[PDB]
Design an enzyme around this catalytic site. Sequence first.
Site, short mmCIF file in Angstrom:
data_model
loop_
_atom_site.label_atom_id
_atom_site.label_comp_id
_atom_site.label_asym_id
_atom_site.label_seq_id
_atom_site.Cartn_x
_atom_site.Cartn_y
_atom_site.Cartn_z
CB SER B 206 -51.76 25.31 14.48
OG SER B 206 -52.12 25.69 15.80
CG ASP B 569 -21.13 2.87 20.60
OD1 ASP B 569 -21.42 1.83 19.95
OD2 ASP B 569 -21.27 2.95 21.83
#
Lengths: 616, 608
Positions: B206, B569
């Site tokens: 944070s 691909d």
Amino acid sequence: GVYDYKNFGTADSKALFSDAMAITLYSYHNLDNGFAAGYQHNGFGLGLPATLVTALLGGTDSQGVIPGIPWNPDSEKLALDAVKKAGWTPITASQLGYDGKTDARGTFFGEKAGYTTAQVEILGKYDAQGHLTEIGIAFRGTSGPRENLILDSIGDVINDLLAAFGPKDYAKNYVGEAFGNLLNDVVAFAKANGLSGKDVLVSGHSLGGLAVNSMADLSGGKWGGFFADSNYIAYASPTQSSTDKVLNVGYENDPVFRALDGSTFTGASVGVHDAPKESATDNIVSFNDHYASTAWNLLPFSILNIPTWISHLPTAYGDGMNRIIESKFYDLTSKDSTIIVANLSDPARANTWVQDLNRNAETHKGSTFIIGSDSNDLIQGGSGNDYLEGRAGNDTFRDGGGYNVILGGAGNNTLDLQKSVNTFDFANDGAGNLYVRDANGGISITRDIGSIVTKEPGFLWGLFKDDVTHSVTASGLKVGSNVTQYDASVKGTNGADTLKAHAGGDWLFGLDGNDHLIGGVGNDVFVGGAGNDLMESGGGADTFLFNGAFGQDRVVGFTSNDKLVFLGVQGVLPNDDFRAHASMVGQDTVLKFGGDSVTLVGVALNSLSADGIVIA
Amino acid sequence: GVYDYKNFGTADSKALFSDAMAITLYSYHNLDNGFAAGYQHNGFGLGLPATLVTALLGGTDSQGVIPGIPWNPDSEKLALDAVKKAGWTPITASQLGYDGKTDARGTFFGEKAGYTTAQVEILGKYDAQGHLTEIGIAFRGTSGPRENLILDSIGDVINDLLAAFGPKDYAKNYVGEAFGNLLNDVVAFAKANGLSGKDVLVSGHSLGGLAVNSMADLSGGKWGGFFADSNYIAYASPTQSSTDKVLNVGYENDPVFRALDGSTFTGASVGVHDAPKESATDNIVSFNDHYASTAWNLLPFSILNIPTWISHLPTAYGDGMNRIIESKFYDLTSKDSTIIVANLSDPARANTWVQDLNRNAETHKGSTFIIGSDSNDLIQGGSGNDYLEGRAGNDTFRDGGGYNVILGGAGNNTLDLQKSVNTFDFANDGAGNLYVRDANGGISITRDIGSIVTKEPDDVTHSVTASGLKVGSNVTQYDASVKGTNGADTLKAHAGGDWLFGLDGNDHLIGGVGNDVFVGGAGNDLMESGGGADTFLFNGAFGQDRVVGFTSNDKLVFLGVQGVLPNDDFRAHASMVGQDTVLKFGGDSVTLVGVALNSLSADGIVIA
Ligand SMILES: [Ca+2]
Ligand SMILES: [Ca+2]
Ligand SMILES: [Ca+2]
Ligand SMILES: [Ca+2]
Ligand SMILES: [Ca+2]
Ligand SMILES: [Ca+2]
Ligand SMILES: [Ca+2]
Ligand SMILES: [Ca+2]
Ligand SMILES: [Ca+2]
Ligand SMILES: [Ca+2]
Ligand SMILES: [Ca+2]
Ligand SMILES: [Ca+2]
Ligand SMILES: [Ca+2]
Ligand SMILES: [Ca+2]
Ligand SMILES: [Ca+2]
Ligand SMILES: [Ca+2]
Ligand SMILES: [Ca+2]
Ligand SMILES: [Ca+2]
Ligand SMILES: [Ca+2]
Ligand SMILES: [Ca+2]
Ligand SMILES: [Ca+2]
Ligand SMILES: [Ca+2]
């Protein structure tokens, strides 16, 4: 009064307001009971975790948001008993011939998809033959029943967001969509009972307040216009209807109250949105631990910072504003009067001065009312004109100047002047008023204050200072053997008197009755009191003091170096000057305050100056 | 691996990650322990109030925000023991010769007005004989010590606000301002111990993640540039440094994570801010009760909608992302892989399918990893390619199609196909892999799933056995197969078509004129079509294989192989070596003998 409504007048509007609050409180079924009790014990700083534990689980004397905890009181029975004490009994779905949804409490639920988390209570007031005389309609704010708290509140918050970002007039139509059918059944029930719309009180807080405003908006064209003349009091509404029918009451430091204009989302909606609004009480402060705290207010004030939501909580609405209703100053107030309500926790109360910080709000104008609690308060008036009310408890007051009324209430009360006794003059009429006049001529009228505290030059020739406590007695202020004399006085009776000032100047106290007060060449202070009083200067630089229901007086001999002081008088709108109250009648300036008046014999209005006419 | 950092290996990056998390958790001293425990037991719905009670008061087994409750565990001692177990000991103000403020715990506090609610932990890793080997710097988030939680939080929120709305470089300069002096002392200590910047690990969550990014931004020019080559791993930071030094880890549904762009407040800051970021893991989902809930999600996703902050809590970071670190699929992942972490409460776990809802996020691409809990999970894969990991407990899986790997883990696990057994083909290699091929050709490789549920118009449960799927005495036979051994085998298909399972070893798989499915397995396998419409399946560390007779109507399937970036691909993996197309996946390869790269079609080549 601050809660005057339509043309009901002072007393009847107060009764209507008290009923509105009662039914609003009922609609929440004491959901915030644990929060209010935790807060009162632990406060909102270091104690915040402990406060939140009580908000959820209550304790042996409160119930939080979680049901079925065996050591909690049945806070829901208590809410039911409290609404009945106020004269109200829920009306059943069966008595209305209503086909929709109710729960085991009799709460009615919203009628359409997207409104199923809407809740409303429908209540009846009955006379001694058991005839219905009044209907109460109280819309629930954001939240629902303890059994379904979270999922119900999500649905409410979705509705709240549509008010701001959904279809134009989503808010207007809310009540039509949620309860259109239920409200037809209520019209039938009222008519069956000889009631009209004027016999209907409509109320609620938060989302319930938006619902009050929606209903007023729709009352002209829906339900046969039956509710057009109903009574609408909304608490902490983010919205205001386009009608003139709604009294929008809230705390100015409540971030939900007035968040929208009157249903429009603006820049202000996420910040301070304290612009004056006609239907709204614009200047009522909840003086709680958050408002008082320097640390908390490092954060931007916003509806989006959740800790600011402490000022939204319904119990402090009920408790603070009931103290406004009971105030001995109530009939001095008007819709936009600046009113500070003491709402501190027990630990904060012991070390925090209740005062007008004017935080996160437009500049306060006019006199300021500060309303204490039934406990020991520390109350600080500002350098303008103040009305300070301690109520019960041993209260301590301070004040920064101007013209003030200070009512100590029950208890052992103290006025701490924070300066030397030698810079003040003190007078006492023997009728319970102790007058305190500062170095600048500022006057406080005080009641029920038994001790005066001063700060005096002390050891090493005034390097160190002494706090000295003086007792207020018939013969003056006393510390041990040392008596501070009252200013030279002539006291009247409650019958008709003639009182004459000595040449060095006197306070002249006519008291009740039509009195003749004859000043001399000295600086006299004229207190006609009640009744119709004739008051002659005699010369010198005189002060004439008018308080309460002071009657019809005549002032003879008023010149340029004299002064009128109106303190605790009727009809003073925030920041009025004398011209709002002054007219010529023949040769005389006449000043009017409610049904009371002062005639300045022979004085042209045009010669008068705000310098010599103090209106508080 | 999703937490790959700089040039460290997969394994070295993981070790760095697990230290960063450990020190990050230590920096909060178990503050959110009560919340995690109440949430686990009660959920975030109907039971949210009881969760909030636990968040404040804890219980018999957890400590909430309030200190000194006697029936609570000493969660702060537990946080200290946990960081020591990971190898770390707090370094004292005294060892560093530091003159600023520490508390009773040894935590260091910010040095300048405006920064006094900043906290940082300075920790040492010591070898066997006990010399300093590493320094850890853990910046605390929003919050501070239980003793002064509210006031300390208010200060931090002011810092948070200034990062968005104050001076332009305010977030960059935060560490300089809060701990400039302290860090000069850390430099001197590290030199005194024979350590340089590369030996320093910097982490936090944070506002502490903001700090990690601030320190990296400052590290070239300040402290003599000593920290320039340090390791910076930030959790759930609203900001990203301008450098390339910081691994910004967070959940995509955590509304604080990446709220700023790298420190600019935009329109997206208060809603969804899920744009791809180079420094950031962009696609890791915490599948918790808020994320799963239809009701909750009728409200706007917003950093300003406080209940959304459930996804920000550090315990779910450490627990959920530790399960990613431990995953059998870890080495298939990369920085922006879609990864769904099962983070449900006990009650929601019972009736909620962990799945990629893609809620309040940009469109997920490529394969999806779903990581279960050690309890009984319901796990649902999408219609694309999925890697489903049950871990311990009795897990039930559904999957919507595509090419999948399903790891049952320990327990009695079930795959519910929701369709008739007749619409699937089943094959088994005898080595723990059950292959499920759907009517569309999609293949799931499953392990440790001993039950299959189908619908037969009506649920029917089949046992997975060596001779078929069984319902009592009734058998659904496996597809025709020839099983090899873990030695080198020559396996020949029958003319009707077979599944050929080489297993380990360099095998020679000889297809026939029928439709065969070739699974070379580990080792360097030689595989000959023989004609027909054949499928060649490659999984895991499959070796260097040669495929002979590959033609137009044949299919390659790569599933659970190395080096597959989201939505790759075959062209990203194919080249020509002589007359052969070679497809490469990390160290493993497929050579298609005599096949020209231009003859290949992505319908014939599945890359998951
Ligand atoms: Ca509701
Ligand atoms: Ca107004
Ligand atoms: Ca105001
Ligand atoms: Ca004053
Ligand atoms: Ca009092
Ligand atoms: Ca009193
Ligand atoms: Ca009299
Ligand atoms: Ca009189
Ligand atoms: Ca006179
Ligand atoms: Ca009079
Ligand atoms: Ca005069
Ligand atoms: Ca802090
Ligand atoms: Ca990225
Ligand atoms: Ca994403
Ligand atoms: Ca799939
Ligand atoms: Ca599991
Ligand atoms: Ca399992
Ligand atoms: Ca073999
Ligand atoms: Ca092999
Ligand atoms: Ca073949
Ligand atoms: Ca072929
Ligand atoms: Ca192989």
